[PDB]
Structure 1
């Protein structure tokens, strides 16, 4: 009846990770504003390292006249946009590192498993830093839109406007992903509950590193739209069009490698340097042609 007992809590994870999560404010001038800054959009962000590099969603900082970053300790900074990527919806920011900066716990060897308890840290409706608890519902999700599929962590930890760019961590405080999207589509006009998506941490890291080194993310472009693999379409003046590639041809192997899954192959296509040459096997009228083509970098978006 009396308690020296310890209540079940995830405070440990909170104390470890929360300080690294910051409030991100996208300030824009308005024709209305008449020279006064107003909040276009607000969200969250994660301090990745001591240098002051911060991850956040791109849609949070788009078309921002000024970007303000607020720490939980009260410190406020004017953020500097290092770079952004529309494809992953990621953006990196830089701030003054004078004095101590909290960093989000990161474990590269850690493997996120379905059923793991996770906490979502962010600033919903600008109420202040909010912590919601859930689990990892699924991994490798393509998101709301099938087209242009990209990996996602699905969690039932409550996610709302302002949570974007914020952190998703486990009970140990380790970063699991960056909260990005919430499912809104309704089959019967009902409201979807407990379905939110986050960019896996490993991917976030790789994209950050690339954005820190270069102003942008660089990928290989081949100018082809297809389905598991035939060529559904050919981009005008594309590397494919330049190679004289023709629509309606199946593709067996590319870069001395098999091509059963378009997703795997396209990912591999983006890894290589722009301008490089590589073999491509295609079967037209049952002929194993081997056209040679020069790659170009992915068109800016």
Structure 2
């Protein structure tokens, strides 16, 4: 048995096919079994239309034995492209061994595994090309930026939602196709634990719209709009400001700005560093929750 062939066969029983069908449509994706009680993690864009129109869509999970079982949506986060499904009273489930994405290093050989019984599924191979790389992701759901694992293994429709696997057959990331990018497993563990526990995930918000700017004076995220009543208006952030640092994270562009805001604590004061007409101004903002009732 080949070295990658061995690793792929070991995780195959943990990867499932997710089929969402209507009367005149269908959609397939991949998923990962992360808990023996039937908890399945996929990315949000696989199930997005079934969540926005649950009256006309049916979502089933197809195991690698050919077994087809109905699925129920526990929760979903469009801001990290993550979702949690639940199959009830299924026994002898082979659960995936989750790893530590903080122990991953550039050059490590990886496998991007898709669901074996998927229609046009794929298993691709490569190395980790970059770590902590902000990447923008684009139905009626919002566009977001994740701080992702980059790989030269092909991520596509056939392995999206499946796991990124290290050479110890451990899940280190969730492939997303929304050249290849994956959601780190530690990020996935937080979002999934919150979605199982509450059915929702509350992310910080500041009320700022930004664009990217890079020159010899100051480089970062230029404020394009400040919302009314927002924490930014209360903190002093003005339009045409250039945010260069959000909390303890430097901001090189509007994409890293989105990631750094989600790393702030809700309700706690935070430093925001800004270049205003050639002067460095340090502002203090208190992030608000994006969902007040669920929080």
Counterpart in the other structure of 2:31: 45
- CA 1:136/1:216 → structure 2, altered by over 3 Å: closer, same or farther? same
Change (3 A) 1:287 1:177: closer
Q: In the alignment, which residue of structure 2 is the partner of 1:132?
A: 124
Give the superposition deviation at 1:57.
1.3
> What are structure 2's unaligned runs of at least 5 residues?
51-56, 213-219
> Structure 1 residue aligned with 2:42, among 44, 56, 66?
56
Given that 2:121 and 2:158 are in contact with CA atoms closer than 8 Å, whether structure 1 keeps it comes out as no
2: CA distance, partners of 1:154 / 1:251: 25
Return closer, same or farther for 1:288/1:120 CA change in 2, 3 Å cut-off. closer
How far is the alpha carbon of 1:216 from its aligned partner?
2.0
- Corresponding residue for 2:64? 72
CA deviation vs aligned residue, 1:176-211 (integer Å, no higher than 9, x gap): 2111127xxxxxxxxxxxx32221222212211121
Of 65, 72, 78 in structure 2, the residue corresponding to residue 86 of structure 1 is: 78
Give the Cα–Cα distance (whole angstroms) in 1 for the partners of residues 259 and 146 of structure 2.
10
User: After the TM superposition, which residues 178-189 of structure 1 pair with which residues of structure 2 at under 5 Å, given as runs?
Assistant: 178-181=174-177
Tell me, yes or no, if structure 1 residue 115 matches structure 2 residue 111: no
Counterpart Cα distance in 1 of 2:110 and 2:96: 14
Is the CA contact 2:38–2:90 (under 8 Å) kept in the aligned structure 1? no
Give the match's secondary structure for 1:142.
Answer: strand
Q: Is 1:261–2:257 an aligned residue pair?
A: no
Alignment TM-score, normalising by the size of structure 2: 0.75
Task: Give the alignment's Cα RMSD to 1 decimal.
Answer: 3.5
Are the counterparts in 1 of residues 202 and 291 from structure 2 also a CA contact under 8 Å? no
**Aligned residue runs from structure 1 range 181-220, under 5 A:** 181=177, 195-220=179-204
Larger Rg: 1
Whole-angstrom distance in 1 between the partners of 2:130 and 2:277: 42
Give the number of aligned pairs.
Answer: 272
Q: For 2:187 and 2:41, how far apart are their aligned partners in 1?
A: 12
Give, in angstroms, the shift of residue 16 of structure 1. 2.5
Identify if the C-alpha distance between structure 1 residues 286 and 214 changes in structure 2 by more than 3 Å, giving closer, same or farther. Answer: same
Q: 1:102 to 1:111 in 2, by over 3 A?
A: same
Question: How far apart are the structure 2 equivalents of 1:293 and 1:117?
Answer: 41
Asked if the contact 1:124/1:160 (under 8 Å) is kept, the reply is no
- Tell me, in whole angstroms, the C-alpha distance in 2 between the residues paired with 1:231 and 1:249: 5
For the residues of structure 2 that align with 1:49 and 1:69, how far apart are their CA atoms? Answer: 15
1:62-85 CA deviation, whole Å, 9 max, x = no partner? 122221111112332211111111
Cα deviation, 1:1-35, whole Å, max 9, x if unaligned, reads xxxxxx533233123211100011112234xxxxx
Could you tell me which residue of structure 2 aligns to residue 188 of structure 1? Answer: none
Aligned to 2:216: none
User: Residue in 2 aligned with 1:233?
Assistant: 225
**What does residue 4 of structure 2 align with?**
10
TM-score normalised by L of structure 1: 0.74
Distance in 2 separating the partners of 1:207 and 1:198:
15
Q: Deviations along 1:27-47, whole A, 9 cap, x unmatched?
A: 2234xxxxxxxx521010001
Compared with structure 1, are the counterparts of its residues 258 and 43 closer, same or farther at alpha carbon in structure 2 (3 Å cutoff)?
A: closer
Q: Deviations over 1:68-124 (max 9, x none)?
A: 111112332211111111121111111114422111112227622222222221148
CA distance in 1, matches of 2:95, 2:188: 15
Q: 1:159 to 1:252 in 2, by over 3 A?
A: closer
Instruction: Tell me whether 85-94 or 210-219 shows the greater mean CA deviation.
Output: 210-219
State the distance in 1 between where 2:144 and 2:101 align: 28
Give the CA deviation at 1:169. Answer: 0.7
